[PDB]
């Protein structure tokens, strides 16, 4: 974090766009930011009113080195001096993809376009050797165009409140989005996020349905995944797309396809 420091006085807060237990994300008007253009809309990541502060700091350290990508929420600046730590991001108008799709409850191409950009964005993370711990529809944002951006509501989401996060250790985790090796062996590779992508792929073509509908997370649930159980075809998906999901749902971690291949898989469908 060398040149990313932005004046806190040139920042004008607005309404809160989602608050966690210890942190919040708000809308803001930034003066003198891009071309020093008329003040634009930005997303500011912050903490609500100590040990947790360091968690946000490393998140900022990650952004500056990861570089800017079209399908990843871009870092525009930061405020680390004289006050609470601020993280200025690119503002997304339509919010998360999860709430955006149930709101729809737009063509089939747009569903493919979303998945393509997500897989293309994930490729950029694999190239940088980075593993997304919570890849889902609730962690991807949509902007003014047909483009989607990958993000992480760490400290931004009250994981205690969301039903998706179940207690299986000393912290909640998205069970229905995790790979088998992560479930019982706690192994997290980039091919584990491929599994998460498959689950993500489902809720995209199932329009924001919770995965494994009707069936809750219990002692029985873990046994199905261990038995190689996979989900049925979503309603708005075609046959070719479903084969990608079950490929991402291969029990053997090696068998799952690389995100590079996924970029090429969905791309050919234009
Ligand atoms: C993923 C990666 C790179 C590994 C990573 C992420 C990370 N850490 C993060 O990415 N943190 C993070 C958290 C939130 C945002 C964020 C949220 N929102 C925006 N950016 S824009 C926006 C707009 C919203 O809607 C407001 C009103 N709605 C508008 C549209 O209509 C309905 C209402 C709601 C939330 C929201 C960005 C980054 N650290 O590493």
Author numbering: 600 to 648, 652 to 707, 783 to 947
Sentences copied from the publication:
Here, we determined the co-crystal structure of FLT3 bound to quizartinib. FLT3 adopts an “Abl-like” inactive conformation with quizartinib bound. The DFG motif adopts a “DFG-out” conformation, the activation loop is folded back onto the kinase domain to mimic peptide substrate binding, and Glu 661 on the αC helix forms a salt bridge with Lys 644 in the active site. One favorable interaction observed in the quizartinib-FLT3 co-crystal structure, in contrast to the top-ranked docking pose, is between the tert-butyl substituent on the isoxazole ring of quizartinib and a hydrophobic pocket on FLT3. The pocket includes Met 664 and Met 665 on the αC helix, Ile 674 in the N lobe, Leu 802 in the C lobe, and Ile 827, which is immediately N terminal to the DFG motif. The carbonyl group of the urea forms hydrogen bond interactions with the backbone nitrogen of Cys 828. Further, the nitrogens in the urea moiety form hydrogen bond interactions with Glu 661 in the αC helix. The central para-substituted phenyl ring on quizartinib makes key interactions in the kinase active site of FLT3. This ring is sandwiched between the gatekeeper residue, Phe 691, and the phenylalanine residue in the DFG motif, Phe 830. The juxtamembrane segment, however, is not observed in our structure, and would not be compatible with quizartinib in the active site of FLT3.
